[PDB]
Amino acid sequence: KTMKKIYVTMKTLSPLYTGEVRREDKEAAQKRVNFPVRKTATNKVLIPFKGALRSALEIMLKAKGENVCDTGESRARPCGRCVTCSLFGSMGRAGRASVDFLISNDTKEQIVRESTHLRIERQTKSASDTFKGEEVIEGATFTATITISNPQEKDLSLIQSALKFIEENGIGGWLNKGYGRVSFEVKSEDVATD
Amino acid sequence: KTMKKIYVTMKTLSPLYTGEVRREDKEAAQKRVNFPVRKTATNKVLIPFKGALRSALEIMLKAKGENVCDTGESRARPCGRCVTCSLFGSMGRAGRASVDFLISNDTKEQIVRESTHLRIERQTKSASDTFKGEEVIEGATFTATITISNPQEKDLSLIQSALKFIEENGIGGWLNKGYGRVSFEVKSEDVATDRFLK
Amino acid sequence: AKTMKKIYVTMKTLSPLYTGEVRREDKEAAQKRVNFPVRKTATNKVLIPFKGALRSALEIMLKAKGENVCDTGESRARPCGRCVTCSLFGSMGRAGRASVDFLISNDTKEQIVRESTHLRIERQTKSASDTFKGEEVIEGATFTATITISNPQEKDLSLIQSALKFIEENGIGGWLNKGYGRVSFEVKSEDVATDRFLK
Amino acid sequence: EIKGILESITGFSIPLDGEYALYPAGRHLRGAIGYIAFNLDLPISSKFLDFDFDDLPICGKIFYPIYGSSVLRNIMARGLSYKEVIEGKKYRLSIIVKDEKYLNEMEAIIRYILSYGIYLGNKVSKGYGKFKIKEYSIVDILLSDAIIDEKDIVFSKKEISSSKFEIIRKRGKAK
Amino acid sequence: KKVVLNINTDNMCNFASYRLMPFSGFIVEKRIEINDKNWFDMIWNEEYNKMRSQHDKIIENIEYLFNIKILSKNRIKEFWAIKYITQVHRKNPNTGRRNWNPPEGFTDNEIEKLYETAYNTLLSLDKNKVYNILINFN
Amino acid sequence: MIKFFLLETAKILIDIGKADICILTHVNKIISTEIDDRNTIELTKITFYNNSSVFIETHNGNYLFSGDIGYPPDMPDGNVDYLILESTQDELIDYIERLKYTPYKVFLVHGEKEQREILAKRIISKKIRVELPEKKVVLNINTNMCNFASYRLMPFSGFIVEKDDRIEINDKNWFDMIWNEEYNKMRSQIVAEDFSTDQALPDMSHDKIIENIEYLFNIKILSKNRIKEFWEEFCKGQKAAIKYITQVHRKNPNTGRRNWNPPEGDFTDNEIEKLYETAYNTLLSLIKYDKNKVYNILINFNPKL
Amino acid sequence: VVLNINTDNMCNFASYRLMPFSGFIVEKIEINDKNWFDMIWNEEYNKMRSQILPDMSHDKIIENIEYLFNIKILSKNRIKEFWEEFCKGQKAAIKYITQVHRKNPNTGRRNWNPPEGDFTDNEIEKLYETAYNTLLSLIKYDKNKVYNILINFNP
């Protein structure tokens, strides 16, 4: 058979935030910044890339008119039959898409910066609270490769449409405040035995 | 099944100042200017836009008499039942209006100039303090895209009214000194979410 | 509150008017032609700082009257936050209610701004020791601003009008000692509702 | 026999009993190499289906049963809570080849790893457990957990194309 | 006294029949090398961190404090000591603000009184006795 | 516009993707002779004319694709703006000349170089312009001209810069300006002995340093930003802290001011100068101690640093 | 690879001898500075078009600049403008200093700031020529030393 390999290179046009999950490094960072960026031991930054793709395809496929799940919504366990359950996986069956974490091509000492955020009263118009959160600069190029096993004809188009939905909505956190408006360059390849 | 994409172009009628957020960039700039502007690493100007719209709508809806909460006082939580709570987000429910940053079309050498600002003694009329601050020129244009998911009927009206409030008050910093008086132009477009699914 | 005060201020210039250019690139681009450029917009109009002139005027008159008004003109001085000017223009704790605009002119630079020549006459010998060319704004030029008070009190229009008469008395900006900046003001205020734009 | 160095690009998590494994075992290596054989449709993937076919952190010397648990970090997701090892570390690869029939197939598997990579641990489709090869070749060939008739050893055989998970729980010696 | 180049030779441009690329970096000497600004970010931070290397009434009080969300699971989790309560109670003299969560729904002197009540309650609080009552607040 | 034929406004193809193809002689829909000649269709009013021609009346521009011409042809009697003509010679001339409202620009296509050049020269001598075919917008920011070999020419060597929306053309003044800016940024990154060997100071006790620092923290001379920058300049060595406190305490001879924050109080000038030199001597005695001792000194006033 | 820059002004950050250095990596693999570029650029700027100083010691310069700064002949404004004219090349700084020093035959004035202090006219002319010779010798040095001289006076 054949396998699909999709290389995504990611250029952020807006700043990007993704909160750090490691409790040890969070409490090591919560004495200097209150919202640390998700980082590595290699001092790189990775973004969760899978649930953004799955959510993009799920909203688009639900609103166009087919049968898909909701997922990530309390006890919305996957059905195992829909297009998203084939592509990105289900509970009983296994995923056909192995979507990597979006590793940045640069280190944290050149694209990740501490930044100031505020909360300002509406009658006095003065800064009531502040907090330090890290963020990823604009133009920082992230790199991932996703791997699709047993592809259909509507596989590259679906991943492309979900990627364009990510360029609209955003990736990471603080999406409503403007963080994460990024762009994707895509390169596709089909590999076989030998 | 529907979104409301609003394309906002904003032109500065007054010189515009917003403040640099990044600490490293700021101490790189504090050797030349005491007040740098918020800039990208793509050398473009950055303006926060969600808080200005939310503050405008909260002030106007509190003045009208609707039961809209104040997310501006210290560590106050959104209640989750107001029009602004549904539009820009509560603690439980996320924000329906995904407000983009106000990205300038030009870069820093075109529209950002450093400036001399003074403090003058009231008697003796002499320049007592001096400081340099970067500011954005008049006539510079900025672009934002507000995406409203599950759009109600009044969302365009409330967003346009908030933009008129930002026209009358200002955006950014130094608002009492005359900075940041702008003018907005709105091109709304009703959008099906499945447009990318070709 | 539910009401806001809008004071539309119209300036007619009676003497020559100068306010020096503050942008370093524009000033350095103008020093090859004039030694004193006018503070000018990128849309070729003229802007004047207005909040500091009103605050300086009100602080001088209220200090003369005997009120407990701070001097924020001293070197790195902090406003206390209890003065009337602290309530109007601002303090370090809370922002001011009055939102004063720049005085943008109603005409473009080629119509109101002229390039003039000043000298330094030596006391004996009556000769031109030094000679410098500076830009100025002509008489009869009209400027406009909007002072926006968010929480109006009863003494906000009166103090703004008194500060405007003081600015008429002493001059708005630049070379006030040589006779520049003597201007006149028309005031048309209106208390507008805060929820006006919602409809 | 294949000596090699596996450098972790992304962190990995293997639950145990909620204890975790500081280093991946050869069990996950065998399972992932079997997925490499199956997805590229090599015949030796059938040999990966049976339990027996009979064919470590890295000082260049590999460690022996100080690494320690300090490598483990607690991670809280959207609602999930687990722990993982950090990346950026060189690990040992020793694929012992005992037959000449499947040596070329194993070398082809290793070449596919050298082109793209190999996934070891939980949440493979989420990107966890990336392992890049750094060095490899071919050489001439207690310390790990050994089964002898004890400590609980749990290994699993999720057969693909049958949709069956069964987690074998046996007893064995301690390294 | 040799010369090694640690700058990327990628993005090579052509001018005056000449291969060239304008760069802005640091000349380092111990060999003489040309390291990019990144080598200088690794060094500065490196050394900067190196420099860095050298029963009823009180239970009723948490029962009332939990309903108004001044004492959230975000508090008792960090509780589970006197320096931390003093840091949380520390009113900054320049802005007049404690690190406590504000109550929901109250005059200013009342909110100051419940801040003092929360301080007195968590100051009054064996480790097993600390492990009880807080388990019912999660 | 037409790309070499795809003519957007849509993306209608005349004889690629998302198109309404119209084949010639001599996608989503294929339009050919169904509609015969003399009949109009909509999609942009499209009308076909017999050759022995596609006529698209759009909102801006009325485009005519001719096709191969062999015999009197058939031409529209309306208004033509662009005339796409094949060239592979007098037959094309009158086909152009006998058409009312002669087009703005004609296009030559499907031929070699010599025949297209000869026909192009024949059409410039008829006073109709030609185009001879073989994306970020580009901006000349330049400013002298020449007339060599009947081309208006300028000898210029420069730089091309590529942003996300445009590509600009700049001269050496822009490169000099950005080089001076980057040289100023590079030289403001280092001081000669940062983070180096530890380097003529007054000495004072620890309790007096506590008393003086507390007294200049109550009144606003030694503040949190002052302690923050003092600790940051102390981290990069002893001489850096010496230079920082000499820069802060420096009285300008032209204005008579120092970089200390003025005290909050009713002190007279001599007492304010005594407090300024008290701050200078107190921090000079503070640079003597070890780093952990100074950290224990300054954590009680600035908890961040 | 051969560096074509002399490694002076060389700061001491720990055990890492250091220089901030801007330049071009020519792969002819030579590393030249901006000066080679200007001599390159004017090269094409005369080629394509065709196809269609006194000596002063470094101690004497800093002593003279200190003396003229004390009597305000060499102001901060003057040192800054000389620095911007020196950054544009040696010839532009030569022309600027010649313009500043030039005695106008009509007015009899020079563009230097007059000295602060009781001086006789001959000594004032000597101070003007001292400023001319000192800055004319400052054009001769390379940029990194001419900033390290002028950083002490106009930060």
Ligand SMILES: [Zn+2]
């Ligand atoms: Zn499903």
Ligand SMILES: [Zn+2]
């Ligand atoms: Zn609410």
Ligand SMILES: [Zn+2]
């Ligand atoms: Zn006050």
